[model samples]
Target: GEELFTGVVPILVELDGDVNGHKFSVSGEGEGDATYGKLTLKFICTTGKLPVPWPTLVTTLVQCFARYPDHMKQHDFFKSAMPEGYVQERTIFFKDDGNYKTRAEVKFEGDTLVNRIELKGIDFKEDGNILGHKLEYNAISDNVYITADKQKNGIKANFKIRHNIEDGSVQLADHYQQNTPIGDGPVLLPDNHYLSTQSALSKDPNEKRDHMVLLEFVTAAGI
Candidate 1:
């Protein structure tokens, strides 16, 4: 008894860092049953924003857990949601109402979302080919248009959500956006037209502010 108690060793393990007053601490703990060695598995949402919707979201969550011993398939939600694809287009208005062309595509070769955004420039007919560049989502913001010498790609994609715009009071987010993506306010749709419904979220008097909306509400509807 004395040997077992006196010669005991202690160990400390840090499973988290700075789980501070910063809000993301949905404290939880669990232990499996004492039979079959009961090597079970489980998951819990860490974000305190899930709405836990009525049957849809909850149903999907249940399906996920039920697939405990099965391979996960690409659900109908995410693929259509954050579509994994790329597009290269050029818009030049002239004779027949088109003046741009590009042969860009988004493909995955071993997890790397390989994209080809290279294309020609405006003023199609006699404008010659304007050099287009390759792109990839490299961390903090989809840093497209990485180039050299009088170069730029994408302009005013609309969907870079920041606030309750058009219904705000300069709430720390009062500025014109440029080159975020071909967005319609808050929806982070693919830059390629093929992935889009070719429709704006709503019609706006300015027309520029009329792309898409309410994406945040949908993304955060886990109540």
Candidate 2:
């Protein structure tokens, strides 16, 4: 006998980072019971600064949760499993730059439903400089609440970062520069050959980044 399933669909996610080349994939199983289901992400980083020993990259990526306040928000699926107001901290040791260490801390304030992130690590230009950064993020929406089959079912978050460089200068970097959406789901179709569907920093109609950021997803069940 053969097993029969109600549906199958592809789950695609788009990623952007400084070290990673900018591509990844994940699959989700749609079972009637959400409590007994699994969502697995299979990813590969092609570009960006490759820390020595590829496994180190995995650890570094995992440690990113501490630096990213958006990930700590109560609405974020990854951190949602943890108790509200729980704080996550991590320290990453790098071998390439004289064993320099980077430390990150995140505090979740359930009362206000805000996630606060603090990062202190070696400066990208100079080791002793020690860069410090901070961010406060709130939940915009939680994708898990939506039906999996809904084409637009995914997480959406807004964040603001206080980037304090080693020089003691602070600048505010808003994640949602415009009305653009940010999430773990794929926005670009496979056929689209553009690196990024929209310009990253350029608001001008004529000044657009030439590179195209393409993304696609496949799911076990069609939702």
TM-score of 1: 0.19
The candidate 2 region of ten consecutive residues with least summed lDDT is 191-200
lDDT of 2 at 29: 16
Candidate number with greatest TM-score: 2
Q: Candidate 1 lDDT, tens digit per residue, 1-223?
A: 1111122112111111111112221111222211111212122324443121111111011000111111212211112211233232333222321122333333333422233333222332222111111111111111112111112223222121121122332111111222222222222222221101111122224533212111100111101
Q: What TM-scores do the predictions have?
A: 0.19, 0.21
User: Which residue window of length 10 is worst by lDDT in model 1?
Assistant: 56-65
Model 1 has an lDDT value of 0.20
